[PDB]
UniProtKB/Swiss-Prot annotation:
Its EC number is 1.3.5.2. Catalyzes the conversion of dihydroorotate to orotate with quinone as electron acceptor. This is Dihydroorotate dehydrogenase (quinone), mitochondrial. It is found in: Mitochondrion inner membrane. Belongs to the dihydroorotate dehydrogenase family. Type 2 subfamily. Pathway: Pyrimidine metabolism; UMP biosynthesis via de novo pathway; orotate from (S)-dihydroorotate (quinone route): step 1/1. Substrate binds at K74, N119, S120, C121, G122, F123, N187, N192, N267, T268. It comes from Plasmodium falciparum (isolate 3D7). Binds 1 FMN per subunit. One of its GO terms (cellular component) is mitochondrial inner membrane.
Length: 376
């Protein structure tokens, strides 16, 4: 009930959201969300998640299948509040070794009609040292907090605008923040850092993955794991949707050869040009117009990797049916971003309820049974 109690479905957040979406600049709305979360004003989801919808990637045990994608809490300033909206994990970042402002504002625009976003942020963030401090404070609160004990935090790492060789920046971040992360996401897919997506070429990607796995493995050589797993972070790579079939196949071969732990499919696209209000805007597109592109990409990569590399789905997930489509395509877990922007505080409670209903209606015993079922 949205009227009798303060909870994630509280009606006033919907009224306010509809006002913001009509009249207020996107990044300003986001700053207000982060302000509310920073002060823990936001409501909590207090309910037991269904045991039949839990999922895992190796030893990462997600209490439910929905997390928040990178770029939402770039600096890790309200991890707690976002998770307590009902999400099982969050990926903070993308961070870089040194703080940087990113591109000039305005650099984010929304199209409500088509539930789409375009952004040219440019990796704005406070820098690895400060974000590490934020994550350490979270980890210290998490040890005492009944609600946060099993929640997972990943960290997405990238390079500073000026950096020649991306591996130097990735190594700096791993050595600073890696011991507080449940997983590291290697961002080689932003469309807003010129040349970054060239690092998806097989030779370059292979060297990047091995360098990152080596730097993580060297942490124990130099109490250690102050994270949820109590184990060294897993390594994921976040992939761009704008690739041809030859590129996707060579990437899949590298992911198999390097024993990467998972792949995040996918980042924003540069190939959607049928949104009027975006016509002269720069950046990558998120939201409902990305859904089909990224689901097909999941199917392709699940098959190219012989179902051996777990998939984190990202792209146009708004509803329980969208989530089930991703899972049946091959994903083990889903990340939301645009859903939070357009459906607001209730996003996680609503989508979890809708997916539990679908799993019943479709005859699945649990969610794991549905993973990859399109291909069976
Ligand atoms: C404003 C904005 C900033 C983003 N920043 C990052 C980022 O820093 N790192 C990253 O890997 N993805 C970033 N993303 C991409 C999202 O993580 C996600 O992959 C994408 O928005 C597709 O999901 P969606 O359709 O549910 O929005 C950003 C997206 C938006 C809209
Ligand atoms: C980085 C980055 C992202 C962006 C853009 C894409 N993000 C948003 O548009 C955004 N993010 C979160 C909300 C929100 C949901 N529900 C709300 C409720 C309120 C309330 F008014 F009730 F307080 C305010 C905001 C929200 C909105 C509208 N810009 O930069
Ligand atoms: O900072 C950004 O511009 C950004 C990064 C990223 O990975 N994806 C995206 O759409 N934007």
């Amino acid at each position: 009930d949205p009227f009798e109690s303060y909870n994630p479905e509280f009606f006033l957040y919907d009224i306010f959201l509809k006002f913001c979406l009509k009249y207020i600049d996107g990044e300003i709305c986001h700053d207000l969300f982060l302000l509310l979360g920073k002060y823990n004003i936001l409501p909590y989801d207090t309910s037991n998640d269904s045991i039949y919808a839990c999922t895992n990637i190796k030893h990462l045990d997600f209490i439910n299948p929905f997390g928040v994608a990178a770029g939402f809490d770039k600096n890790g300033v309200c991890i707690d509040s976002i998770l307590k909206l009902g999400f099982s994990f969050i990926e903070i970042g993308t961070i870089t070794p040194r703080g940087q402002t990113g591109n000039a504002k305005p650099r984010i625009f929304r199209d409500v009609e088509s539930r789409s976003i375009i952004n040219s942020c440019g990796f704005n963030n406070m820098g690895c040292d400060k974000v590490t401090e934020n994550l350490i404070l979270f980890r210290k609160r998490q040890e005492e907090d009944k609600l946060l004990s099993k929640h997972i935090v990943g960290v997405s790492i990238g390079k500073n605008k000026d950096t020649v060789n991306i591996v130097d920046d990735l190594k700096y971040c791993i050595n600073k923040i890696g011991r507080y992360a449940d997983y590291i996401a290697i961002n080689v897919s932003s469309p807003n850092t010129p040349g970054l997506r060239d690092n998806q070429e097989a030779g370059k990607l292979k060297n990047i993955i091995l360098s990152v796995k080596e730097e993580i493995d060297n942490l124990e050589k130099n109490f250690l794991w102050f994270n949820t797993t109590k184990k060294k972070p897993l390594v994921f790579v976040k992939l761009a949707p704008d690739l041809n079939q030859e590129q996707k196949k060579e990437i899949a071969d590298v992911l198999l050869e390097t024993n990467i732990d998972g792949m995040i499919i996918s980042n924003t696209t540069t190939q959607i040009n049928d949104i009027k209000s975006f016509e002269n805007k720069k950046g990558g597109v998120s939201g409902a117009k990305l859904k089909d592109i990224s689901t097909k990409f999941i199917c392709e990569m699940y098959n190219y990797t012989n179902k051996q590399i777990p998939i984190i789905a990202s792209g146009g997930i708004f509803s329980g049916l969208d989530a089930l489509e991703k899972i049946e395509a091959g994903a083990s877990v889903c990340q939301l971003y645009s859903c939070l922007v357009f459906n607001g505080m209730k996003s996680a409670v609503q989508i979890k309820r809708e997916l539990n209903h679908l799993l019943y209606q479709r005859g699945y015993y649990n969610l794991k049974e549905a993973i990859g079922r399109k291909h069976s």
